[model samples]
Target: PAWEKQQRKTFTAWCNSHLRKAGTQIENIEEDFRNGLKLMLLLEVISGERLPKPDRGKMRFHKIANVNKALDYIASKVVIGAEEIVDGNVKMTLGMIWTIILRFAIQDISVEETSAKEGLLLWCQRKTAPYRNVNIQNFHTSWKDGLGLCALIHRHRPDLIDYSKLNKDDPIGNINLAMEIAEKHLDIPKMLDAEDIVNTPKPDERAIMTYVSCFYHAFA
Candidate 1:
């Protein structure tokens, strides 16, 4: 009972939720399901299976457009969140905006045949689902802040972002040819490795004093 109780603290049910036709595993056929990437990410933790080489390109953010607006387009500042509203347009920071955007169906309001406001409001309502006062805060988009992340990236790096031949609308997909160049000639590395986002930040999150700082192999 003691062992079972302790193990239950770390319980994880490793099963797929969606249903599909069951089939036998075959050679040259990798995963037969849509959700198997979680298996690959954990392969190293299982630490026995030799995974097929990864396509590093899949590691980056899926490039999708945010509804862009010029600063003046919004009649004034808006401060809305999933649970509460704060005053002042100043309430929207990059972190806050990102926190909100990551919850959307796409990276931002989908720019289909619909108006951006309609798309955004559609998603915003879903995200705040069942909350009665979904439209308590108003948002207007007269100005365009295109490339919200790309623009913020203009503020990235000690130097200018290496926009390079990176087409603004140039994109990534279930791709290979671009990643090949990135590996060989372009010298771009996919996705910075990350440390865990441990909440209750005091323990090891401080970059100056984290485990990587203290215990990382010197040659590594």
Candidate 2:
């Protein structure tokens, strides 16, 4: 309970600090942009706990501020165009990048069932696909949506799907286990077809396939 309280306090502080700054004028920036940032900060707090310890360190104030500075510098066109483009992509791409990094760093994949890399990634692809497009204002919205779907899927499929019996060191085992469960319990198609397992729905109208996408993103 103490850890939960601490996490809540940390999240609350993060929200106050970030969202409070939205009142300042930033040229033509829309209010939604600021609101989106607030949402992102909240999601980061919730999801950050699911990340491995070392990965969590990378999100600390100093590191994140440095990252933001780096992003702003590249956005200002101070660097080589190609290099700047690569740098510009890091912020948007770090979720997937960090997913792999944490998977290897932690070396233990059975701690959290719902937050497994495969499940997280699956969730991201399904729920965040719309916001991941270049034209979208921000992908944070999609991230939040994906997280919501993860919760919904968990509620519908309360069955315990564990794969720790396999190679515990291998994160892929978790994905494989999830796929196995999806196929076995939900009658999901094994292949990636129009009517694949990920598209299949539970009797309660909950989509298991989309949840698989969320799982991938959450892990990624």
Candidate 3:
């Protein structure tokens, strides 16, 4: 699915942002994390605490040993199958990163009268409600046309986007414009692609929420 690819790109970028502090980098979310050293480094970077020492031995067994330590560190917080990450499962690895992203990044979103998910939902809805043809709801079909996204930015920074000229007929163009402007002007990551949302029959809700939360954190 398109969302899966988007998640992989977005999560890898997020991971690298923290891992840069530890002088560690990852190219392949699944393969690079197979040995678990990068995963341990990532945890320590995010939590600012040293995890259990990882195995340095060279063997498949050693790789799992290191992965186990990293998995154990987060066992209390997020439950994931160890073999999935160790065996280089792409989908499972992306899911693991998304779980971590939700816990560490998206969970703290708080708006004026609400908190977390409600806060984000309320924020988006309130900002985009006044715009014509833009309905900010459930983070799925509501954003399929991309007007909601453009409206949110136009509400916050009108000079950055001319909302009046935007057309729903050009959903892909609208989506691309919103993403490009958000990234260039607002410093928000372009996590979701236009094709992922506009072309998809039912874009992934969680992925859409994750991307929209970036707007809340940036503008609200």
Candidate 4:
């Protein structure tokens, strides 16, 4: 914790070196740039928990609540820059940089299905044949779109479930698991409160509760 705190201060100092040039006219310059691409970079690269500050307890903007939790967050909510790590020769729990946590690689999520291709689909990539390696700066559909969705939710619907909040450590791809559980365990959406499996102490209980309590409103 002290280590991350120190690194954050160091990065803040680096940004300040440039930001200070703006003079006394700028107020809360650090706070001012806390949510855009700039904010995303700092949060993702340094702080493990970047988006929502968490419902209870104290954690830093750059600190990670837990390593395993961060990985799970990356799987569901974030569909973009995440794969870049994989594409870049680093592993999921590991990356181009530290394996401590996934930065902007970490996003929020829900239980459902998406046919979306993480990176460009082959069809889309072929469209860029003429330009070859020269690609658009920030318009990559995967990262841009995923980040866009998170930003949209962050601004418009803060109450639902801050997709940017990395507080809850869901099981990786647990949204899909929840979906599966919904069908397999609670085949009784036609019935009331699937009793036999609601409170299991292990295995799918976390996924079960996540769906039943947080998102089962649709089917249940």
Output the number of the TM-score-best candidate: 3
**Which pairs, if any, clash in model 4?**
44-103, 44-104, 47-62, 48-62, 108-163
Clashing residue pairs, candidate 1?
69-143, 69-144, 69-145, 70-143, 70-144, 73-142, 73-143, 77-89
**Model 3: C-alpha RMSD to truth?**
2.7
Candidate 4 local lDDT, 1-220, one digit each (tens): 2323222332334333333333412223233332222323333444444553322323332223322234444454444243333222223211222222222211221223322221212322333334322232222212111222222222333453334342123323323333343344434121112222222222222112222222222322
Candidate 3, residue 4: Cα displacement in angstroms equals: 3.2
RMSD of each: 24.1, 17.6, 2.7, 21.9
Candidate with the larger lDDT of 2 and 4: 2
Q: What is the lDDT of candidate 4?
A: 0.29
TM-score of each: 0.17, 0.20, 0.83, 0.18
Question: Where is model 1 more than 4 Å wrong at Cα?
Answer: 1-40, 43-146, 162-220
Which lDDT tens digits does candidate 2 get at residues 1-220?
A: 1322222222233233323444422221112222223333323343352211221233234344433433343334221122322233432332322232243222233333544444344433443343222121222222221233323234355454322133324323333454455456554322212222222231101122223333333334
- Expressed as tens digits, the lDDT of each residue in 130-164 for candidate 1 is 33322312221110111211222222321433333
Q: Which stretches of candidate 3 lie over 4 Å from their true place?
A: 1-3, 17-25, 53-56
Instruction: Rank the candidate models, highest lDDT first.
Output: 3, 2, 4, 1
